[PDB]
C-alpha cells in the first residue's frame, strides 16, 4: 500500500502519494538515513558488548617482578569463555532485534505489526546461513575448526530451531490467528530454561574448571579472554641346539631332533623321554614319552613338550630331555652328540615393581586435570592395590592451589600402567612456583589363586570370583570396608623344607615399590598467559581519552569521516571502568533503544513510500542491518579460537534469544494488555508461517552440511580444504538468497 501510518518519532511526510520522482527522492532519503542508523547501531552495540564483557569478567592485579628494586604493577581483567558468558554476549548482540520488536509493539498501541517478527525471522535466516558461511570462509587455509562439544551443539541447535517451530505452533496449530496470554508467557519463559541450561552445561556438561586453558589478548584496553584448548660316516641322531629356552606361558616348547650323515634312504627309530631337574614333572612341565621315526629322505623331526603355567612366582628352572634306543628297521644309525637337551623355564609371575616415571615434574597452573603415570615393571601378575595420596608442600592446596585426592589404584592382571588425576586450580598468576607431592604406599596383592594363597600363607578372607586363570578359580581378598554375605567368604589358610623353599620363592614375587615412590610436582605460571600479559604491557582522564580517540589510509579516512558523527556522539557514553561496567551498560542500552526507535520508523516509511511490504523490507534490509554485531562477534570467535564451538554457539544463542525475548516479551505485553480489555490479540499467521517453515527446512540442510563437514577428508566445521570451503560458503549464501526471494514472492500472495 502507498499510505503511511504515523511512526513513534518521525512524522508523516505530506502529501501522500505525490508523484513518481518524489517517491524516488523520499525512498532515497529514507534508505540513506536507515543505513546511517545501522552504522550507529553497529558502533553502539559493539560498545554495549564491550560493557557486557566488562561486567562478566573477574578483575586481577598482576605483580610483575623485576631484577631491579622497582616492580611495576598492572591491573587486568580475565573474561572466561563459557556457555553462560557466550549466551550473555549473544543476548547483548541481539539487543537491536529485541528492542525493535518491543518498541514497535508498544509504540503502535499494542497492535501486531509485520516489522518485528519479520525482522526476527529474517535475522534467524541471516545468522544461520550468511554468518555461518562467512565464519567458514574466514578461517585461514590449512587450519580447521571443529566442534569439540557435539552434544551441546545438538541441544542448542535443536532448541534454536524449536523456537521458530513453536512460533509456527502458537500461530497456526493452537488457536490459529490468536496469541493467548499463556502462549506468549511460555514463549518468554523458555529463555530462563536456556540460561539454566547454560549454567548446568558449564558446571556438569563441560567441566570448564578442569579443561586446558588458553589466553588471548582482548579488544579492550586490559581484557584477556580465557578459553578451552587442547592439552599437550654312519648316520647319527642328535639334538639341534642342546639347550632350549622358553617362558612359562608358552604352553609347549619345541625341540628339534636331527638325523645327519650315512644314507638318508632309510628308516630310523629313536625314543625320547623327559627327566626332572630343578623343575618337576606334573607341576612345572608335562611329562612326555615317545618314539620318533625318520623316514627315507627325512632329516629333522620336531617334538613338543608341554609347559604347565601357573600363578606362583618361581626362579629359573630346568629339566632334561634324553634320546635312547636308536634302531633301524629291515650300526647304520647311532646316538650322536648332543644326546641330551636342557630346557630352561623362565617364570613370569612377578607381581610387579611400581614406580613413578620421573621424581620431579613441571606443570602449568592452566593444565586443568594433570595425569601422573604409575608404572609396573618386571611382571604384571595378579590384581594389586597401590594406595596413593597428595601431600601439601609450598602449594597449600585444599582448593586453593590444587584439590586433595587420595585413594587406591587397582592394577588388573597383565596391566602395566595406571594414571592418577590431580585437579590443578588456575589462578592466573604472572609468576608462580609452588610445590606439592604425590606419594604411593605399600602395594598389596589382593587377588590370586588358591595354591598361591597356600604358598603365601594368607590368613585373610577370600570371596570366590567367577574368573578363571590358567585353569584355576580366582580368589579375591575381602576388605574391611566391604560387607559380604559372610557365607560367601572362604578362609583358605611339619614342612618338608622343600615346600618351605617354595614358599620363600613365592614371597620373593610379591609386589614392592620401585625407585621413585614420591613425586614432586611444581606448579608454574602459564606461558600463554605470561606472553599475553607481555603483549598487553607492550601496547597499553579516560573521558578525555574517548574524545581524543573519536577524532584522529584513504579508506581509513573514508570510514573515519563516515563514522565520526557516531563516534563523537557515543563518546559521551561513560567508560567501562565506571560502576564495574554498569555505567556504560545503562546508557548504551538506552541509546540502542533510541536508534532502533528511528529504524522502526525509517524501515516502515521506506516500505510504504515505494509500496514495499513491511515483511519484505524487514527480511532483506532490517535483518541484515541488525545482525552486524553478530557477524563480527562470530567472525572473531571463529578466527581467534581453536574450536568452532563459540562461533556457531553465538549464532545459535542469538537465534534462540531473538524469539524467547524479542517475540516473547512483546507478545506477552500485548496479550496481557488486550486480555485486560477482554479482547483477543490477533496476529495474522499467513505471512510468518511460510517464512518459519522455510527457515526450518533450510536450517536442517545447514545442520546436515555442518555435520557432514566432520569427515576426516574435510576435518571440521570451519576452514578445511579450500575447494570444499568455497562450495560450503556459496551453498549457504545461495540458501539465504533462495529464502529471501521465496519469502518476498510469498508475501505478495504468489504462494
Amino acid at each position, epitope marked *: 500500500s502507498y499510505y503511511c501510518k504515523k511512526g513513534v518519532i518521525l512524522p508523516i511526510w505530506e502529501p501522500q502519494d505525490p508523484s513518481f520522482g518524489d517517491k524516488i527522492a523520499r525512498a532515497t532519503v529514507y534508505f540513506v538515513a536507515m543505513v546511517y542508523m545501522f552504522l550507529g547501531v553497529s558502533i553502539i552495540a559493539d560498545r554495549f558488548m564491550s560493557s557486557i564483557e566488562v561486567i562478566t569478567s573477574q578483575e586481577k592485579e598482576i605483580t610483575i617482578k623485576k631484577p631491579n628494586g622497582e616492580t611495576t604493577k598492572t591491573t587486568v581483567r580475565i573474561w572466561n569463555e563459557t556457555v553462560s558468558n557466550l549466551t550473555l554476549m549473544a543476548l547483548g548482540s541481539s539487543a537491536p532485534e529485541i528492542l525493535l520488536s518491543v518498541i514497535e509493539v508498544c509504540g503502535h498501541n499494542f497492535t501486531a505489526g509485520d516489522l518485528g517478527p519479520s525482522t526476527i525471522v529474517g535475522s534467524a535466516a541471516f545468522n544461520m546461513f550468511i554468518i555461518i558461511a562467512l565464519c567458514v570462509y574466514v578461517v585461514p587455509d590449512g587450519e580447521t575448526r571443529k566442534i569439540k562439544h557435539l552434544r551441546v551443539f545438538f541441544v542448542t541447535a535443536a532448541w534454536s530451531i524449536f523456537a521458530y517451530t513453536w512460533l509456527y505452533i502458537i500461530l497456526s496449530v493452537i488457536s490459529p490467528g490468536v496469541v493467548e496470554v499463556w502462549e506468549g508467557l511460555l514463549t518468554f519463559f523458555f529463555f530462563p530454561i536456556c540460561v539454566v541450561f547454560a549454567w548446568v552445561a558449564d558446571r556438569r556438561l563441560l567441566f570448564y574448571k578442569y579443561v586446558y586453558k588458553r589466553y588471548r589478548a582482548g579488544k579492550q584496553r586490559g581484557m584477556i579472554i580465557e578459553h578451552e584448548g587442547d592439552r599437550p660316516p654312519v648316520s647319527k641322531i642328535f639334538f639341534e641346539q642342546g639347550t632350549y629356552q622358553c617362558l612359562e606361558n608358552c604352553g609347549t616348547v619345541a625341540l628339534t631332533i636331527i638325523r645327519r650323515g650315512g644314507d638318508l634312504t632309510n628308516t630310523v627309530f629313536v625314543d625320547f623321554r623327559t627327566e626332572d631337574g630343578t623343575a618337576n614333572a606334573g607341576s612345572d612341565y608335562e611329562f612326555t614319552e615317545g618314539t620318533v621315526v625318520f623316514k627315507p629322505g627325512d632329516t629333522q623331526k620336531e617334538i613338543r613338550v608341554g609347559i604347565i603355567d601357573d600363578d606362583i612366582f618361581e626362579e629359573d628352572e630346568n629339566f632334561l630331555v634324553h634320546l635312547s634306543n636308536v634302531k633301524v628297521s629291515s650300526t647304520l644309525a647311532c646316538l650322536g652328540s648332543p644326546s641330551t637337551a636342557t630346557v630352561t623355564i623362565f617364570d613370569d609371575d612377578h607381581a610387579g615393581i611400581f614406580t613413578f616415571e620421573e621424581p620431579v615434574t613441571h606443570v602449568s597452573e592452566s593444565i586443568g586435570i594433570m595425569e601422573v603415570k604409575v608404572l609396573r615393571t618386571s611382571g604384571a601378575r595378579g590384581n594389586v592395590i597401590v594406595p596413593y595420596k597428595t601431600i601439601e608442600g609450598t602449594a597449600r592446596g585444599g582448593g586453593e592451589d590444587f584439590e586433595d585426592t587420595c585413594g587406591e589404584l587397582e592394577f588388573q592382571n597383565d596391566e602395566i600402567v595406571k594414571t592418577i588425576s590431580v585437579k590443578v586450580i588456575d589462578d592466573e598468576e604472572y609468576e608462580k612456583n609452588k610445590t606439592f607431592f604425590l606419594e604411593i604406599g605399600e602395594p*598389596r596383592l589382593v587377588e590370586m589363586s588358591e595354591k598361591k594363597a597356600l604358598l603365601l600363607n594368607e590368613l585373610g578372607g577370600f570371596t570366590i570370583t567367577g574368573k578363571y586363570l590358567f585353569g584355576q578359580p580366582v580368589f579375591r581378598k575381602v576388605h*574391611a570396608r566391604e560387607h559380604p554375605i559372610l557365607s560367601t567368604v572362604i578362609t583358605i589358610a611339619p614342612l618338608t623344607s622343600k615346600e618351605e623353599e617354595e614358599r620363600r620363592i613365592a614371597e620373593m614375587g610379591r609386589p614392592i615399590l620401585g625407585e621413585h615412590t614420591k613425586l614432586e610436582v611444581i606448579i608454574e605460571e602459564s606461558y600463554e598467559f605470561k606472553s599475553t600479559v607481555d603483549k598487553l604491557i607492550k601496547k597499553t582522564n579516560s573521558w578525555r581519552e574517548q574524545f581524543i580517540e573519536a577524532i584522529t589510509s584513504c579508506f581509513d579516512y573514508v570510514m573515519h569521516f563516515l563514522t565520526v558523527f557516531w563516534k563523537v556522539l557515543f563518546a559521551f557514553v561513560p567508560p567501562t571502568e565506571y560502576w564495574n561496567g554498569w555505567a556504560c551498560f545503562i546508557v548504551s542500552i538506552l541509546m540502542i533503544g533510541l536508534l532502533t526507535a528511528f529504524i522502526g520508523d525509517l524501515a516502515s516509511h521506506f516500505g510504504c513510500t515505494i509500496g514495499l511490504k513491511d515483511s519484505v523490507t524487514a527480511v532483506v534490509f532490517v535483518a541484515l542491518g541488525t545482525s552486524v554485531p553478530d557477524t563480527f562477534a562470530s567472525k572473531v570467535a571463529a578466527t581467534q579460537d581453536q574450536y568452532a564451538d563459540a562461533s556457531i554457539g553465538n549464532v545459535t544463542g542469538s537465534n534462540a534469544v531473538n524469539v524467547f525475548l524479542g517475540i516473547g516479551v512483546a507478545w506477552s505485553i500485548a496479550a496481557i494488555y488486550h486480555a485486560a480489555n477482554g479482547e483477543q490479540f490477533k496476529v495474522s499467521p499467513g505471512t510468518l508461517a511460510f517464512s518459519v517453515t522455510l527457515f526450518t527446512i533450510f536450517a536442517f540442510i545447514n545442520v546436515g552440511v555442518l555435520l557432514y563437514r566432520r569427515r576426516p577428508e574435510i576435518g571440521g566445521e570451519l576452514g578445511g580444504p579450500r575447494t570444499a570451503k568455497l562450495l560450503t560458503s556459496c551453498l549457504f549464501v545461495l540458501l539465504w538468497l533462495l529464502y529471501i526471494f521465496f519469502s518476498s514472492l510469498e508475501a505478495y500472495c504468489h504462494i
Partner: antibody
Amino acid sequence: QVQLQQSGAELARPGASVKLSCKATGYSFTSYWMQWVKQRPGQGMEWIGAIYPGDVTSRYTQKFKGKATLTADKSSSTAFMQLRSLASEDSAVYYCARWSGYYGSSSFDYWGQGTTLTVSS
Amino acid sequence: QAVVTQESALTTSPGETVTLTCRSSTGAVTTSNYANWVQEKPDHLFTGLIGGTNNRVPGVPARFSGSLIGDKAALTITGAQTEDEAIYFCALWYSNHWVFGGGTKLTVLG
C-alpha cells in the same frame, strides 16, 4: 589422641606358645599398618613384621617367618602376634607401632608401652 | 643381612648442636633406605621422630632434623634440651625388611 595399649607382663615355659595383644584406639584401625618389633638388652632392636588388618596382609623377616604369626581382630580393633616353640632367646620386650603405609612418613609413629615376655623354667 | 652401626654414646650440654650418625654395612645410605629416627625415653617410652630421612612427625619439636651427610644418615639436634636425654635408634629399609641400629645413648648434662 592415638593410643596403643598392650597386655601385661607374661611368663611362659620353653617350647610353649604365647599370644600377645595390642589394642589400637583413636584412629581407623583397618586403614593402617601395625609394626611388631622385638627388643632385647644389648642386642639392639629387631623388626618382627608388619600387618595390614584391612586385608590381613603380612610382612615378615626370614628369621621370624615361621616363629611369629600376625593376626587381627578388626571388630575389637586389636592386633595379635603369636610366638610358637619358645626358647631362651625369646625373653624380650615386644612393641606395636602405627604405620600409615607410606615410606616417606615415619613407619613407627605411635608405639605401645611394651610387653615383657620371659621364657624360663 | 646388613648391620647398621652407630656410636655407643654421645655427650653434650644444653643449648648445643649434636649430630648422630647412621651407617649401612652394604654401602652408602640413599633415599631408598628411608631412614627412620625414633626415640626411647627411660622406662620404655618410644616415640617416632623422623621418617623418610626428611619428614618429621607432627608434634615433634622443631629442633630435630634428619638429613644425609656423606654416605650416612644423620640426625641433627640444634639447641638440645635437658629433656632430650634418651636413646636414639635408626632404622633402614632394605629390599624386604627394616634393620635397626645399636642405639645412641644421648645424654645432656644438668
